[PDB]
């Protein structure tokens, strides 16, 4: 998170970081056995940890569990990130807590104009290269179809949409991608792709989670 703040720890917790060895992904709890994340954060081995601040350091409120299952979006696009969106089955049932609680899935789609919490452990910098070890936080809105599309001619799909400020400045970035988006209380959005990172007239780019709650729902009664 590039422009952001040090969100408080544990003030986030249906964030999770996804673990390969290193943090290289975020994710969203979803219910005690069920993370979103995005398709392109997909790796064999993956150790979810919940209930995180500082990732480099164990602080007592972590709950570290290995995935048992990853279910890639059956339309993944890997070229264009459409239908960048992946489920993980833990091994076994999260104990939900005060650290460690789930985020609801969308009933509706959110709005232009509506500002969201984004929030993940990946670089803080627009020009080169910082790693918090504390999860940081940002907030931005919903930009309309119309600028999206303007910033990023014949690659926004309607299983995308722009988040952030055309000014620069502040906005996801690697290390983020697959954690959440979230507007009204609920998650709208999973963090994706966008021209670098914070870079002017180049927002971040997010899987629009409300088209895929028909699919999660039947994956999650079916696994
Ligand atoms: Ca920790």
Wanted: net charge positive; charged share 10%.
């Amino acid at each position: 998170i590039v422009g952001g703040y040090t969100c408080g720890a544990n003030t986030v917790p249906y964030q999770v970081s996804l673990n390969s060895g290193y943090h290289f992904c975020g994710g969203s709890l979803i219910n005690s056995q069920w993370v979103v994340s995005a398709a392109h954060c997909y790796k064999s081995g993956i150790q979810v940890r919940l209930g995180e601040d500082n990732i480099n350091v164990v602080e007592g409120n972590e709950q570290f569990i290995s995935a048992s299952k990853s279910i890639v979006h059956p339309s993944y696009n890997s070229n264009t990130l459409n239908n960048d969106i992946m489920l993980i089955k833990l091994k076994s049932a999260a104990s939900l807590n005060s650290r460690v609680a789930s985020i609801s899935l969308p009933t509706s789609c959110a709005s232009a104009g509506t500002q969201c919490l984004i929030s993940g452990w990946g670089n803080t910098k627009s020009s080169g290269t910082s790693y918090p070890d504390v999860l940081k936080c940002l907030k931005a809105p919903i930009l309309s179809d119309s600028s999206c599309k303007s910033a990023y001619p014949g690659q926004i799909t309607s299983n995308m949409f722009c988040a952030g400020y055309l000014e620069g400045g502040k906005d996801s970035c690697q290390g983020d991608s697959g954690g959440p988006v979230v507007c009204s209380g609920k998650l709208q959005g999973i963090v994706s792709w966008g021209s670098g990172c914070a870079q002017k007239n180049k927002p971040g780019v997010y899987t629009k989670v409300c088209n895929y709650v028909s699919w999660i729902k039947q994956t999650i009664a079916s696994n």
